[PDB]
Amino acid sequence: VQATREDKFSFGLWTVGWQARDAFGDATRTALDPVEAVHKLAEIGAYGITFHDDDLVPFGSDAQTRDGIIAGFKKALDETGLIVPMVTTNLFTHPVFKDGGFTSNDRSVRRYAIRKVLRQMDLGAELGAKTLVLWGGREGAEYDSAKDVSAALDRYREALNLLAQYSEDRGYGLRFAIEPKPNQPRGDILLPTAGHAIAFVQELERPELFGINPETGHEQMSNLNFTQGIAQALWHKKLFHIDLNGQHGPKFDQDLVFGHGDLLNAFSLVDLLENGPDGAPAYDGPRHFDYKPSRTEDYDGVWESAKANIRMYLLLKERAKAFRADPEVQEALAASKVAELKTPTLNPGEGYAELLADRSAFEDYDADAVGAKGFGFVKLNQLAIEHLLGAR
Amino acid sequence: QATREDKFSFGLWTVGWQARDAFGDATRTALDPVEAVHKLAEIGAYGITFHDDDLVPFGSDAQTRDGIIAGFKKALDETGLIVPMVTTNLFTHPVFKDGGFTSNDRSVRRYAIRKVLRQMDLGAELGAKTLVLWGGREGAEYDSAKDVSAALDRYREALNLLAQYSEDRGYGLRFAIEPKPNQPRGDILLPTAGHAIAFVQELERPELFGINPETGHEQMSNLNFTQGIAQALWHKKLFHIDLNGQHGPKFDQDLVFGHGDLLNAFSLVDLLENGPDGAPAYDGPRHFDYKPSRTEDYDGVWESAKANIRMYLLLKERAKAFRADPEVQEALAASKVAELKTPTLNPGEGYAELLADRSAFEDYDADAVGAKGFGFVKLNQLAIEHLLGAR
Amino acid sequence: VQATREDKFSFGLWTVGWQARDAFGDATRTALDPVEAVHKLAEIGAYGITFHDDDLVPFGSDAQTRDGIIAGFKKALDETGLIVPMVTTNLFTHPVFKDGGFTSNDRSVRRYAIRKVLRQMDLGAELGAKTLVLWGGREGAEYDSAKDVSAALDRYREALNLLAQYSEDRGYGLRFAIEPKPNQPRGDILLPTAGHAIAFVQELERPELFGINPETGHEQMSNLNFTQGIAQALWHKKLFHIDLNGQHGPKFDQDLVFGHGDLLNAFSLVDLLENGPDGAPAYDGPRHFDYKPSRTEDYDGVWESAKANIRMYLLLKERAKAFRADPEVQEALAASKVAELKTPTLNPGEGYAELLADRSAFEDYDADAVGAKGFGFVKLNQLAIEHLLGAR
Amino acid sequence: VQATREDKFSFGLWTVGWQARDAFGDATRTALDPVEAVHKLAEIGAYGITFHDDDLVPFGSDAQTRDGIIAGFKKALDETGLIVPMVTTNLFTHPVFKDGGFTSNDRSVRRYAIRKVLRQMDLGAELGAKTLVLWGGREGAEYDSAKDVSAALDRYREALNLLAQYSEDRGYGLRFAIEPKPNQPRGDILLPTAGHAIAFVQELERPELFGINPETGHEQMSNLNFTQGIAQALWHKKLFHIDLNGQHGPKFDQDLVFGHGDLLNAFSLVDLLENGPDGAPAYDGPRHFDYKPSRTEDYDGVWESAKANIRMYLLLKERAKAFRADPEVQEALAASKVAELKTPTLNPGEGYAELLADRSAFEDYDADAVGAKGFGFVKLNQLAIEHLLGAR
Numbered sequence A, C, D: 001v002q003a004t005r006e007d008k009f010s011f012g013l014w015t016v017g018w019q020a021r022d023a024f025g026d027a028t029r030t031a032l033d034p035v036e037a038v039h040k041l042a043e044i045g046a047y048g049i050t051f052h053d054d055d056l057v058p059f060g061s062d063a064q065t066r067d068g069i070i071a072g073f074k075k076a077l078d079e080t081g082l083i084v085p086m087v088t089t090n091l092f093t094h095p096v097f098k099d100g101g102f103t104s105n106d107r108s109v110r111r112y113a114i115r116k117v118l119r120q121m122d123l124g125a126e127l128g129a130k131t132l133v134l135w136g137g138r139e140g141a142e143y144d145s146a147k148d149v150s151a152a153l154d155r156y157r158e159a160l161n162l163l164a165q166y167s168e169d170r171g172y173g174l175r176f177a178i179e180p181k182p183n184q185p186r187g188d189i190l191l192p193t194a195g196h197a198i199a200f201v202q203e204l205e206r207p208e209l210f211g212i213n214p215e216t217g218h219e220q221m222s223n224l225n226f227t228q229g230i231a232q233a234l235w236h237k238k239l240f241h242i243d244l245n246g247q248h249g250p251k252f253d254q255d256l257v258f259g260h261g262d263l264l265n266a267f268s269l270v271d272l273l274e275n276g277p278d279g280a281p282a283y284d285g286p287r288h289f290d291y292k293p294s295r296t297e298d299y300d301g302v303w304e305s306a307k308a309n310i311r312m313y314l315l316l317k318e319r320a321k322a323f324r325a326d327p328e329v330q331e332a333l334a335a336s337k338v339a340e341l342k343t344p345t346l347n348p349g350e351g352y353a354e355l356l357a358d359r360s361a362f363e364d365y366d367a368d369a370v371g372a373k374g375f376g377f378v379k380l381n382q383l384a385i386e387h388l389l390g391a392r
Numbered sequence B: 001q002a003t004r005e006d007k008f009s010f011g012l013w014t015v016g017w018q019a020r021d022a023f024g025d026a027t028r029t030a031l032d033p034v035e036a037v038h039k040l041a042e043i044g045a046y047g048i049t050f051h052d053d054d055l056v057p058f059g060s061d062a063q064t065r066d067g068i069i070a071g072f073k074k075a076l077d078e079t080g081l082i083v084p085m086v087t088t089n090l091f092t093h094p095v096f097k098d099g100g101f102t103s104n105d106r107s108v109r110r111y112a113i114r115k116v117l118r119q120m121d122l123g124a125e126l127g128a129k130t131l132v133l134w135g136g137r138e139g140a141e142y143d144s145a146k147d148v149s150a151a152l153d154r155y156r157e158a159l160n161l162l163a164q165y166s167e168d169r170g171y172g173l174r175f176a177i178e179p180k181p182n183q184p185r186g187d188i189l190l191p192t193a194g195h196a197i198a199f200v201q202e203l204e205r206p207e208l209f210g211i212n213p214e215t216g217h218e219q220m221s222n223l224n225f226t227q228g229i230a231q232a233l234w235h236k237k238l239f240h241i242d243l244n245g246q247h248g249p250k251f252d253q254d255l256v257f258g259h260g261d262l263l264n265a266f267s268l269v270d271l272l273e274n275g276p277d278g279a280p281a282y283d284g285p286r287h288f289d290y291k292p293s294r295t296e297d298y299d300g301v302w303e304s305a306k307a308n309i310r311m312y313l314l315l316k317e318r319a320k321a322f323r324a325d326p327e328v329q330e331a332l333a334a335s336k337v338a339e340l341k342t343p344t345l346n347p348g349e350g351y352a353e354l355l356a357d358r359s360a361f362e363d364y365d366a367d368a369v370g371a372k373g374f375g376f377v378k379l380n381q382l383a384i385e386h387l388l389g390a391r
């Protein structure tokens, strides 16, 4: 029922700190003090906090101010025992970034965007952060003829290669996590899905330092299966971090509490992350909530919502465990042949010639007869939902 | 008018679709393959493609199979049509209800491979250069039913074998994985162009693998087709392309190319044809994977075949005119489209030189730059006016 | 729990009888005998069975054949005690209906469509059906210029008025329910959402005999809130029947078991239907499942899936009940001011003159103070989900 | 071509005046002076201007200021010859409306919301406006249990009835147009489509005074066919006004220039509005553009975008007329039987009795022969498109 530091729950300062100024209205909440955020999160059970440079230090603060703020923040982490597992840079808010940071058509903007990141990398290293998340929110376009995608990908790579060079030379040991999003705020953003982000990373100079930071709602904005995408990310060993939240399909980015959107997929996701090979989780990084307390809430509503994320995750974990431990489930899994997918299609040392000589794989194969046996998938699915519902 | 240099190809199953849908009986009778070859030759197609089962009915004995192939070859011969690509039906028969290569049942997986090997031999025999693989039954309706990790291992296992075989026999085939987000399965493995490219990078001979993206498949997720093709070209993995029309996220419509998202059909033709030199950015077949609407008879079928070609040639013409317009050149200059091609760093500059440049940060006036407009709407308006023949 | 006839669970013969021939493949199951379907349904607790004319009597059966089928059917009904609460007509399968039934551009098709329905109304009336469901699956277009919508709505209305007339005159006492669907099989279908159907119904000669038959996946295909659209249908008093199933947002029509798609919306739907005003349900017609056993299943999976629909409804019902009887939930509802929406805005006898005179409604209204109070919506949503999860 | 006042192109002050502060970044343009707006629009060809109360007069302006602004505003109109065809009220920006205006759970907010509109009605009547647009952007919910939809529709109706009462008694002669939108800013907005809005309006006390104001993007946000919904709206006679813009399916509300989103559907929409019966337009109200100049643009891009809206409409208009006048199209329309849909299904004086007596409509009908003939829809669509491309 209660969270432990071993759970690795983290929250972005920009989450609980969201003032609720949306596209159609003014802020409904006052600004949250970074120091206070540190104490309340520590208090609800979080193990770490994350932030955008501009979330902690107001864009344009002098070094005197900047330094003061960092010192205070640092104290709070100290007193509470919270760590900073990841940091990110704001390359989307200021008007200069209206056509992107790393991929702006304007060369000067591109030089400036890199500088802004190098700086944040420095603070990150000083606070002990291990991951740099890159969300290229303005990289993309509203009109096709406005952006040369090829040139854009060259420029994205150019910037990223420099960042790895630097981290490596300074010995920061950072890992870089590219965050995919299909749209909002640009009409279409470059690297729209977890798949596009993985393919791209494979083309960098030191690909081993790069992975992705997929977000629940981002994949759901395209009506994709989040769990299946994570599974693919895991297969590639590129799941460097993860943003959990809720969404209701293809519409604006809702950023609801984790599990308040597609509940069934929230369940299969916890099951995937926690019931890894041999008991152990399949994923070891932070369970980071990138969500927003609804505009209708006050600070009470804010802390409630922060705890709801933790709660949802632990209730789901609990049922995922019980689902897998149930002998009846175990029996249905067997009947559906789920584990049979783990056995190689080919026998040991078997190649094309041995397979071509096997009459049982074609010539004497009774396709009609195998075609008629059911897989028992509805029943396995029903057992999963009953565990989810606390009915089994 | 189409020329063989335009490289328009059609699948046997497009004009031959009987229009039996999820809710109704077929409204057209079967199309004869020899007949299809002659009719397509006539409308300007340079090539024809087919799934094994479109040409040779599932379960035909060798004599029968052999007869059909011989007739087909003769038709090819007489018309001068080629077979640029072949594919395998791993989705129709009940045995494939949970997948071909990734079925939970090991025996189906083994059978799926034998079915493809056989089609590879025929493709090789017909001179095909590309093997398209559409894993339409690979995926699931429920998350607990499919171990995705094991599924990718098995998908990989099967493809490495296919490459081994092609390479040992000297077939020279290229393999193009075709992504689709859903339908017939709730969720299909390798759902977008991105997922398929990322996957291909993990096979044993990656240089032999690429993708076969379909306009409608990316649009079913509301993705920018042109933008995904641009990324595929950047990775150099555009091995083939399936063109058609779609109206956003709904069942797969397979309309004629350009009958769904017209603006994106226009930017797509511009991308493929107004390539690097002056030359096309893509040199493969312009394959139409579409379906003549169920409301049409055979006159409708041939009309729809021609409409695909017409749409492409009309778009190509306006794409060319768009690029040659001085007013467009001017707008491209104001929007700094070309400035994106200049490296961010000066030659020989690294992080140490960038950090020493006070003008890239310390003395950079972001406020001032942030106020200048890119003039992107205006550029967009000139493009649309070229499309409408308004200029 | 166990279903009782009071639960009024019904299934279409075409649900458990779907042979699983989809758009990309052959049938994976053999045909189900109607009599056998009656027996099996009765055995799992269904109270009724429904059917399309063509599901029971093969298209073009001679009168002797048709009569034979009907008689055997009636005996099964008799023997099992199942009823036929609704009947429907297939105006979509045969090639003649490729451009629609009532709205085909071809006049002779429109005339035939009406006669096919009149014939089904007769059989409906003889079996005791009270509702005739109309699903115009082929009414629409793939291209905008191919169909005059205004003319199409005129012809639709022309056919429906005749049907009401005939029924009225024969004393059949049928109620008509138009079933909306956005697309599939046509690119765009006329009367795409529950809203469009209701607005249409209001224009017929006798609106009182007309309502809608909304389906969970159909509204979800447009990514609309099914519960909220049902709430509006109930407000209008036009919910004549309902089709329950599962869907995963905008994609082909999945027709999964009820609750296997958007679980959270399924939960709020059961709450709305059963926890109606004054203790009792807000809706009393059949709880009809218009779903399809997945193509991967055999006849065992088919009955499993039929039972899963009922189980799903009963489990959510139980949790909806517990939700509302929870003093904490009640306390959250009061804090969120849900019930306060039920109090008129105007005081009894107050008009604009009086409203205009109330300085507390404007001149002395402190918008800023009210604007800062939180509604507690997240917390209320969390308690709801904790009930569904059986965590409370 | 060139716009004339007879084209009736109108624009909201908030359109060209949008400063470009989005959900993720700061404003990229300075504020637009209303008088300048009047002058600039007059210059590009607009015949009228519209606005929300708060667009013109800053929220919380003293009487003198308010009065001051209006007077200058009227001079500019005077000087330029522009009119104010429609007025609307902002019930979505201020924090007090976070849960809605008319249907806020909070009764005091509902009363305030009504007062705010009454005042705008007065200003509207004074400026000569004919239509009051009502966009309930905050009416809806993020969570199902937080909003009683039935009570919300009662409260919505209660507010609308009062407004009609007031206008009629003051002799303002306004018509009311409800604007549907599926989501954004609420997770789900009440009256999500043109359909639901029409159904609702039919339940008001003086339904003849209420219609709808559908927006292209709003219907496309749910992937619906805008042209077909407008055709239904015209069938019902409820198209009181229309908002024209562009959108790229189900995603955040883009508000692109008209015809910059779904070009094919913008084409068919212009054809429907202009190639009306008796040669004349089927719609005679304002052609209002509710769009936003992209965030990447400056004031020059702003006027460019304003003009693009007009050029798009006139270029499309020009091609719709050519299309209809083409003999080959006339031949295709005939083969597709588009016009045969206009001839009643029944012969004059025929009812069910005579239809039942017609063996040719059923007993002797050859469904198979009819089912084999094609409609030539593809050819007809190809011709429409070639006209759109200026290829014919």
Ligand SMILES: O=C[C@H](O)[C@@H](O)[C@H](O)CO
Pocket: A052, A088, A089, A133, A134, A135, A179, A181, A215, A243, A253, A290
């Ligand atoms: O859509 C917003 C993104 O999810 C953002 O919060 C990042 O993760 C950090 O820049």
Ligand SMILES: O=C[C@H](O)[C@@H](O)[C@H](O)CO
Pocket: B051, B087, B088, B132, B134, B136, B178, B180, B214, B242, B252, B289
């Ligand atoms: O959705 C169907 C696929 O597009 C298929 O036709 C492949 O391209 C070849 O099997």
Ligand SMILES: O=C[C@H](O)[C@@H](O)[C@H](O)CO
Pocket: C052, C088, C089, C133, C135, C137, C179, C181, C215, C243, C253, C290
């Ligand atoms: O999508 C098909 C429809 O839902 C159908 O089953 C109707 O409910 C009755 O013809």
Ligand SMILES: O=C[C@H](O)[C@@H](O)[C@H](O)CO
Pocket: D052, D088, D089, D133, D135, D179, D181, D215, D243, D253, D290
């Ligand atoms: O999405 C915003 C609405 O379209 C708004 O502009 C209304 O039309 C006027 O309140």
Ligand SMILES: [Mn+2]
Pocket: A215, A217, A218, A245, A253, A254, A255, A290
């Ligand atoms: Mn997000």
Ligand SMILES: [Mn+2]
Pocket: A135, A179, A215, A243, A290
């Ligand atoms: Mn994120």
Ligand SMILES: [Mn+2]
Pocket: B214, B216, B217, B252, B253, B254
């Ligand atoms: Mn397709």
Ligand SMILES: [Mn+2]
Pocket: B178, B214, B242, B289
């Ligand atoms: Mn294809």
Ligand SMILES: [Mn+2]
Pocket: C215, C217, C218, C245, C253, C254, C255
């Ligand atoms: Mn359905």
Ligand SMILES: [Mn+2]
Pocket: C179, C215, C243, C290
């Ligand atoms: Mn149904």
Ligand SMILES: [Mn+2]
Pocket: D215, D217, D218, D253, D254, D255
């Ligand atoms: Mn809008």
Ligand SMILES: [Mn+2]
Pocket: D179, D215, D243, D290
């Ligand atoms: Mn609007």
